[PDB]
Design a binder for this molecule. Sequence first.
Ligand SMILES: [Zn+2]
Ligand SMILES: [Zn+2]
Length: 60
Amino acid sequence: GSSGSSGLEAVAPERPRCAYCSAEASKRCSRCQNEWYCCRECQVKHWEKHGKTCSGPSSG
Ligand SMILES: [Zn+2]
Ligand SMILES: [Zn+2]
């Protein structure tokens, strides 16, 4: 080879966490996209607490 490998280390992925059940989240708040929620329901239950700061940095 020419470039070769950079280094050999345990490289593992990562994932967010729900804001209601604290479970592996996949989608973020479609309102501010600053929060995480495994399911839509959760994003609705924690709303009371989320909506508080929700809609932070307004953006398309
Ligand atoms: Zn959840
Ligand atoms: Zn939000």
